[PDB]
Amino acid sequence: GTSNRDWWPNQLDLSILHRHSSLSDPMGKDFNYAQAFEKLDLAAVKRDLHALMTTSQDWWPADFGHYGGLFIRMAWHSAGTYRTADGRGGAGEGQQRFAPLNSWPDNANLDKARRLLWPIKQKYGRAISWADLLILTGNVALESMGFKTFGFAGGRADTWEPEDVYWGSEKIWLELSGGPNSRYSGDRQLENPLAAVQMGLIYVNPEGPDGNPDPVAAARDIRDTFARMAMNDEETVALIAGGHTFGKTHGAGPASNVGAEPEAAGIEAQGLGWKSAYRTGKGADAITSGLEVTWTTTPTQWSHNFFENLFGYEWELTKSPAGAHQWVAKGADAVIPDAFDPSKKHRPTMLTTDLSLRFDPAYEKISRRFHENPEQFADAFARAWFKLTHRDMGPRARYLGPEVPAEVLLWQDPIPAVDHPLIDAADAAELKAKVLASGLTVSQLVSTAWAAASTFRGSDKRGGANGARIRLAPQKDWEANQPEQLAAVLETLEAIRTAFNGAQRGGKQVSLADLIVLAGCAGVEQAAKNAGHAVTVPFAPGRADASQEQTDVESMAVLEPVADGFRNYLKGKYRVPAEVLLVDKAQLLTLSAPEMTVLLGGLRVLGANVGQSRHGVFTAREQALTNDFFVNLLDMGTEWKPTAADADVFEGRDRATGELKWTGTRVDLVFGSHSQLRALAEVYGSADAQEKFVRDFVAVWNKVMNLDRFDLA
Amino acid sequence: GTSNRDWWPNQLDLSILHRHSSLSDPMGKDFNYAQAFEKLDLAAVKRDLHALMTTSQDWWPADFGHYGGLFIRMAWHSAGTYRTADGRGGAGEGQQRFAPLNSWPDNANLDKARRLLWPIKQKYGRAISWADLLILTGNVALESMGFKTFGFAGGRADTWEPEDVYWGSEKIWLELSGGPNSRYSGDRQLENPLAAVQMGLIYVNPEGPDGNPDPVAAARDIRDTFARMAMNDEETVALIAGGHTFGKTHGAGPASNVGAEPEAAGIEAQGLGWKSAYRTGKGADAITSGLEVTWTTTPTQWSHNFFENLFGYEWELTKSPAGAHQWVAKGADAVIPDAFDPSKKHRPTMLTTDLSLRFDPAYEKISRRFHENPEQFADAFARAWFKLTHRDMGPRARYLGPEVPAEVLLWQDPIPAVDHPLIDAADAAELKAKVLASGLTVSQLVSTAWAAASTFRGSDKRGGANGARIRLAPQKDWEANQPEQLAAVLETLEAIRTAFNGAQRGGKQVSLADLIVLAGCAGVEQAAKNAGHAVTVPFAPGRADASQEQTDVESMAVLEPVADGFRNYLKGKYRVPAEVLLVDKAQLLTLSAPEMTVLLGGLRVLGANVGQSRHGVFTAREQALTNDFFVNLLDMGTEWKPTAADADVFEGRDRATGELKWTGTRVDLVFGSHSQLRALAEVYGSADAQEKFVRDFVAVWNKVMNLDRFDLA
Ligand code: HEM
Ligand code: HEM
Ligand code: NA
Ligand code: NA
């Protein structure tokens, strides 16, 4: 059946803004997962998981009689899709059970692991999400095998359809670099936002870069991908060595024996895949990655044997029974146990990427320190495992259950607890009046509050106005935030604040984070007044101000908007068209297409554009909240053409006289071009729609200002 | 960006069940279009349309100074996508403004027509939908030019995204038949459900079949395509001759001058397409179809000149300035006015498909009668134009405004007015008890009510239980409805009804249509009781019984279910996998994926299968409403394999003993295979889900029962 995407494959796709509707969700409108979780008997679930570990099923027998390694890999792959560039991927929505991730080659046989968990899922039902269960299971596996975990939080609500993620443009699974859709260019530069070296991999190729078994070159890819998953060298070394203290790989026979991945398998497979024709197809004859490596002498127990073996032998290049490159310890005895036959033993083996930890100079220093100080290795791994598995969960206020670690960690972008009375509605009215009497303009107040709040992204729940991080490095210096203008607004707000706080009793004070948002509200109210409407903008206090020392400057860099269509901003020239980037940003803001449309039209007339650009400012009453943007955009008396100087700026001229009326970008004009967007613009550009426009704007403005308010959730 | 559709292009697509969410809709959750339209000043809108007809815009000059012909073609293409096979297409959702229809080659320059209407759309706002306005504008055009229409109903609510319609498998616009994705096979048999001869056409090729200018062969394509749009020979002749009494075609220069369709055009085109480099690109130099024909001597006035010309001349094969085949009157004078230059006249011209009306013997008889009796022609066209433009509106209860015709038309599947008091809640309870005391079983009651209600399709709002047409020809004889079983059920219910109705006072009575539905409600209640649950199934009275004389048997044929997954039924062997046909039927029922899943699982265990098939009946407590289908489907202790006898039937065997536990079809097992459906099945197969399953089942059963109840809307 030929579809619109077949006819017009470069058209903008808005269905990404309308996923996760109440239509696809089997739970009721009122279902609140946090409340269900809070009543789960988590101790009972963990006992069930501990029993499961050694309860081997004949359709996928447990290696060494313990599924711990398999479930550790399962949880690490659940988390390990995360990219810091956009915050997409990660464990937080349980997307490993949906396409495409359930059929990625790197997730081979994790279908078996998740099926092993069905009876537990079934027993506890809606009280534990698949998303939480996958992580909990990894935790239990580590505990079962003697490793003390740092903690666990629940609260990952399940999702019900695949997330729309750009995973790359290749049309061949695991395509090596340099093809027609190469994710690499230049000196091995991986394109943003990708965080894996090949389509269908988690991070790197375990045989080495593009299958070449050079551990030093492998280390470069490990460092680059793990940095794109928010992990530094010490965390990387701790995670890889920690993970490969357990379990084994599976490569018993040639990969040609392995059949269709789950999404391609026949209906009788009932959701499973990779059925193998090699011998019994399972257990001792399992084929997963095609490598055949068992790292330690006790694969089902925490040990310090990984680094003993890594440093204690010299390594020789060999091949697995499937033909894959791997390494074997020279001159070693057969000390590694077999997973099924107690009469066989094996020599120590390693992956190329394991050897990276020794042959890369910076990793070697870490690896040695962990070898000599195994308590440091244990603590580093426990911490890094928690980070890995919770990195996308958002602020600590979302963490549920009795195992949440008390320690506050820098990467969580912590917010101080509020320990004073909040402002009330009378105080909010007094502060808004003070803000309006200071001389700050609608444009300044709007633009500052937009800049503070619009860092939020729903993919990993980082960012937003809570914390007043807009006054700190690096947000205060971002070009999209207009550093000089920002500094002058903040200085005026801080004087208002000081004056209001010095006048209070009983400990009441207002945070700068609250005041920035409140001042934006006053701006919107003033702009509505300028247009003749009486509008009160809702405001919820309770944000607190974070310190510079609570704000990791390097981790904040990924929030910098290099494209923000809502301020008609683009930091440079990109291969992705600006309207694509607009819809991307709207998705991260959690906006639907009607919300994105109203918001953008209102911001243009309020003076939110960076640099006070006139592009899209289709009104003669700037700083008044009207639907002018729509009404003028849709006026057929204007003809549009790209300028000779810049094909991405357009001039709109009177059709009869040729006189120039307006200029716009691609972000502006898409609303007059895309047939779905223009249908939305028509609703707000109609003669009956000025009130609806103002009210819908206020609603969406409020929504954006509250995106990170999980303290009130 | 590579997507799941690229990796697994044959996987079932569930996103079609989750369109039209509240996310994509810019109107409030409470917006009621009928209530907005009922307050529209329709006479004021018509006066504005009437003015527009002769107010030429210089960006698309009006032919002959009058846009009537353009807007008639616009409204006929809005309506003319309709197919009776599925009820999809038609004018009822305003889909011409979205992809792909806005960019079909047969809709070239209708973008200009829609844009001419923006000022009126903007003036009246939400009180008149684009969908209604398109039709209304066609009516006003006809009226302005002296033609008396049969009437107009409003009520077509606007939609906000493209509908998912199968329009054929061709990858090339207008591909001639016989390619790799040919819509034809055998002796020019057009595949169901298609109703056009080439991808991107409304009905037929105006040059003749695959471009071959033979009027006799073209007539075969006209008759076949129009029959597939519910029009017979008399309606067909009346529509084509009627339409081509007005306006002209546009073919002033070579087609290579015409640029990209709207979905492919540049952003600066602002939603318009087919920009032409031929001379001024518009008006006298317009190019649309490539043909250059003007049919009558008064293209802006109703007349009987189409037939005077058709029969009063002999015709010669010629070519337009773009090279298209067309016909010119031999020996004639220059009697046809030019559209822009009052000093030029032209000879009469016709399309090959116009000449079909003369050279096909059955059409010729009708055409002669219309030529000799033009009052019969005007009446037939009026009626056909109303039918065409309202065929997908549904029951008369949905028709709004002051111009609705009072005559009841057989194609409307009319339902008699109710003229007595309805049953109340106590009467409903007495009837339910009487039904259950008769000895009708849960299976019989459920199967009967499902059969009556599940003929509804949301595409054209035909079918449903209102009418009690299940007791009439042809429904009572459809094989899916189990004619002998059905007759015995109906006979018992009619005795119950007679007894109840003979006992009442004050005119109260119950219709058989209501009692069929009620009896199904008693069945579901009893099945819930059988399982330990006390529930009340909601029921709303007020259906009425239609007569055989009010039921067009031939038009009802297209409602027959040849595939009904909800009853595990497939009438024969098809190219489309059964699971695809299930999701197709769910879409026509207006069901989401969660609703589909609950409904199917419940119907299995209630005994709804045709023939009492045991396929998918995964329970040992048949006729009890439990979640057994899901619990047993998801049990990993059962292994599934296709049977040697039939690859589409599967045996489920105990994995350990090999004992046969169940059988199922592809429809059954898709819920254990497809990763999104199996995530839904898991929620209903969990241990905490039996109350949820009962409640959600009752809700979706009630939704189905009420699909055609637009009297209560
Ligand atoms: C450079 C990074 C890494 C690479 C290239 C990599 C590669 C792989 C490969 C190829 C397998 C074998 C799959 C099979 O054939 O069954 C595997 C197994 C596994 N990995 Fe990793 N790994 C990486 C990092 C991780 C990390 C960060 C963890 C966890 C903290 C982890 C834990 C595991 C465990 C537990 C197994 C054993 C599976 C079992 O016993 O069934 N690895 N690794
Ligand atoms: C066999 C069925 C039909 C065929 C092949 C057909 C073909 C076409 C073609 C090729 C054009 C010229 C488009 C252009 O170049 O501007 C057109 C114009 C038109 N058609 Fe049809 N037609 C059919 C039936 C209908 C029907 C059923 C109606 C309405 C009741 C309709 C009303 C018109 C009108 C009013 C125009 C003139 C548009 C203008 O003045 O701009 N036609 N037809
Ligand atoms: Na994420
Ligand atoms: Na339809």
From Swiss-Prot, chains A, B:
<dbReference type="InterPro" id="IPR000763">
    <property type="entry name" value="Catalase_peroxidase"/>
</dbReference>
<dbReference type="GO" id="GO:0004096">
    <property type="term" value="F:catalase activity"/>
</dbReference>
<comment type="subunit">
    <text>Homodimer or homotetramer.</text>
</comment>
<dbReference type="InterPro" id="IPR010255">
    <property type="entry name" value="Haem_peroxidase_sf"/>
</dbReference>
<feature type="active site" description="Proton acceptor">
    <location>
        <position position="77"/>
    </location>
</feature>
<feature type="cross-link" description="Tryptophyl-tyrosyl-methioninium (Trp-Tyr) (with M-244)">
    <location>
        <begin position="76"/>
        <end position="203"/>
    </location>
</feature>
<feature type="site" description="Transition state stabilizer">
    <location>
        <position position="73"/>
    </location>
</feature>
<comment type="function">
    <text>Bifunctional enzyme with both catalase and broad-spectrum peroxidase activity.</text>
</comment>
<dbReference type="InterPro" id="IPR019794">
    <property type="entry name" value="Peroxidases_AS"/>
</dbReference>
<keyword id="KW-0575">Peroxidase</keyword>
<dbReference type="GO" id="GO:0005829">
    <property type="term" value="C:cytosol"/>
</dbReference>
<dbReference type="InterPro" id="IPR019793">
    <property type="entry name" value="Peroxidases_heam-ligand_BS"/>
</dbReference>
<dbReference type="GO" id="GO:0046872">
    <property type="term" value="F:metal ion binding"/>
</dbReference>
<dbReference type="GO" id="GO:0020037">
    <property type="term" value="F:heme binding"/>
</dbReference>
<keyword id="KW-0376">Hydrogen peroxide</keyword>
<dbReference type="GO" id="GO:0042744">
    <property type="term" value="P:hydrogen peroxide catabolic process"/>
</dbReference>
<keyword id="KW-0560">Oxidoreductase</keyword>
<keyword id="KW-0408">Iron</keyword>
<dbReference type="Pfam" id="PF00141">
    <property type="entry name" value="peroxidase"/>
</dbReference>
<keyword id="KW-0479">Metal-binding</keyword>
<protein>
    <recommendedName>
        <fullName>Catalase-peroxidase</fullName>
        <ecNumber>1.11.1.21</ecNumber>
    </recommendedName>
</protein>
<comment type="similarity">
    <text>Belongs to the peroxidase family. Peroxidase/catalase subfamily.</text>
</comment>
<dbReference type="InterPro" id="IPR002016">
    <property type="entry name" value="Haem_peroxidase"/>
</dbReference>
<feature type="binding site" description="axial binding residue">
    <location>
        <position position="244"/>
    </location>
    <ligand>
        <name>heme b</name>
    </ligand>
</feature>
<dbReference type="GO" id="GO:0070301">
    <property type="term" value="P:cellular response to hydrogen peroxide"/>
</dbReference>
<feature type="cross-link" description="Tryptophyl-tyrosyl-methioninium (Tyr-Met) (with W-91)">
    <location>
        <begin position="203"/>
        <end position="229"/>
    </location>
</feature>
<keyword id="KW-0349">Heme</keyword>
